[PDB]
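Hi,

I'm pasting everything inline rather than attaching a file, because the server keeps stripping attachments. The sequence lines come first, and each chain or strand is labelled.
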Amino acid sequence: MGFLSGKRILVTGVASKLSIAYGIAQAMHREGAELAFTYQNDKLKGRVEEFAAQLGSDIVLQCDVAEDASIDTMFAELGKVWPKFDGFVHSIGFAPGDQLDGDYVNAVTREGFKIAHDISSYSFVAMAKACRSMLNPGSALLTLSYLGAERAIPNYNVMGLAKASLEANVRYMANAMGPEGVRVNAISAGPIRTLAASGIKDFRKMLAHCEAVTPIRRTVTIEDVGNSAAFLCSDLSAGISGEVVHVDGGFSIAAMNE
Amino acid sequence: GFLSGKRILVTGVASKLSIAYGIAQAMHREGAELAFTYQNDKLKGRVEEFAAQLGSDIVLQCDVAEDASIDTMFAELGKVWPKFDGFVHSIGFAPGDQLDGDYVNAVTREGFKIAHDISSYSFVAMAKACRSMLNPGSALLTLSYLGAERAIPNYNVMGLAKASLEANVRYMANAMGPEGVRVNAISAGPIRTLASGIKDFRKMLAHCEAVTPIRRTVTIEDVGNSAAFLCSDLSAGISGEVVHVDGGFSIAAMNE
Ligand SMILES: NC(=O)c1ccc[n+]([C@@H]2O[C@H](COP(=O)([O-])OP(=O)(O)OC[C@H]3O[C@@H](n4cnc5c(N)ncnc54)[C@H](O)[C@@H]3O)[C@@H](O)[C@H]2O)c1
Ligand SMILES: NC(=O)c1ccc[n+]([C@@H]2O[C@H](COP(=O)([O-])OP(=O)(O)OC[C@H]3O[C@@H](n4cnc5c(N)ncnc54)[C@H](O)[C@@H]3O)[C@@H](O)[C@H]2O)c1
Ligand SMILES: Cc1c(CN(C)C(=O)CCc2cnc3c(c2)CCC(=O)N3)oc2ccccc12
Ligand SMILES: Cc1c(CN(C)C(=O)CCc2cnc3c(c2)CCC(=O)N3)oc2ccccc12
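And the predicted assembly:
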């Protein structure tokens, strides 16, 4: 048996075999976790049920994180099979496409700001509120952030604020839930070409420039972050809570190349 | 006055204890011309009174929850200050219920929505509205708290809003830099005002004094001076920065 052996983990945001959530699910199953999955729309229902079936999982439940009721119904359905379980992965992020186009202060709008912060930052607590009573002692919660939280990156715009809010969310959640044996962490992942990479401007050239100046000298993959994710949600990470772990290849800690 | 020749809009003054009151009169002392805003009909009188005490005639209605109110405010300001040299963003709010006890139990979607709407978005929304009017060498300022960067009990979602605000500072600074605009934040230490009203320690909290390097909590005058400096040409080399004005409380750990 590998680590995460006796663990039951819920994985959100699996929209593709390219999704970060797929890479994470693969690693967690390889390490022997019993998984459950969610999907937003009925367009995804077909795909997620198969990825879940490949990974050996009967549990595949709809959930749009915009709605408090949707979240409650999902954890009620999950309760029928998983009365208690050992945490979940928050791999959801959205902001109206047009918000990420050009100059930040031009693009940004009150509604763009709301949706971005609601879906990418609050969604994480909403979900933790709904299943708090089901979490086992020693359980672990994980989310995914980007360097845009810490720095001003062109055309990332409002998402950077949502991610900043999210990283603070990890901190407060970890602090609130610590005492009851629950750890909350985040992975600040490097740039990967997934469903969130389109229709982003200059994404090809951005990865090329990013792979030249990142110390490890390659762009990170969904396997690398899946591995860290599995570790963060495992008892090997029992001493880590409220932390924003950079699975960056070392990009963020360098400056001025070449 | 190192702030002389500058016209700066100060918001969020509602009391002599108010943090913007300290900033305004520090800004006044250094020869700046000031304009003010008030959120409510309730505040109008007090903001008019202090505006008069600082030699200002420009006092305008502005609720930053409404885009129309902001645009009407800057439209009304345009008639007197067609162009000016930036503003001070001393505004924050979450429903009171949100700032009490366990964060996860306290927080709601609506409480999160308002917290972020009023405390973070309003800052850029205001910049958005007056971007046309901002002179080269203009400077924007906002006020934050350590709860952005660490988990403070009973600060709760305000910490998330503040974190968003501090990120907003960097993005605003990066976007508006090329047009000669600077955008920074003062992360102030705890002060007795607001308004902070109905907050649990609080005086227990106010005993940071024992743990804070300078052996006291920071004052409205300390923040006022720093804010004046940050909005002057003296701080021409500083942009997108979160300057901690809390007597070095943030940089210390385990002082008994
Ligand atoms: N470059 C990257 O791709 C990158 C880097 C760092 C962090 N991340 C983060 O990782 C997470 C996954 O992003 P990705 O790009 O790897 O794959 P992705 O594009 O599939 O992620 C988006 C996910 O959001 C879900 N979704 C959208 N809105 C929803 C909502 N309100 N409720 C429920 N489901 C909804 C979809 O199922 C989808 O899987 C995001 O939070 C993203 O911010 C990605
Ligand atoms: N006092 C502290 O302990 C402390 C510490 C660090 C930072 N700050 C920050 O300083 C700023 C002002 O706080 P203060 O201590 O001066 O108390 P205060 O109560 O005087 O300031 C809050 C201000 O928000 C304004 N306001 C509320 N909702 C509004 C809206 N939608 N539109 C327009 N105006 C609205 C009020 O008029 C008021 O002037 C806040 O942003 C707070 O986050 C305060
Ligand atoms: C990296 C990187 C990403 C990936 N990433 C870390 C993200 O957080 C992406 C977030 C995202 C949120 N909402 C939407 C989209 C992407 C695409 C299309 C859409 O309609 N909505 O996106 C960027 C956008 C601009 C700059 C860099 C990046
Ligand atoms: C310091 C400090 C403050 C002050 N501060 C830095 C803040 O950033 C905001 C305080 C605040 C924001 N919104 C409201 C209230 C206080 C009271 C009543 C109300 O209706 N809304 O508040 C705290 C709350 C808990 C712990 C510390 C603090």
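The first strand of chain B starts at residue 7 and ends at 10.

If the labels don't parse on your end, tell me and I'll reformat.
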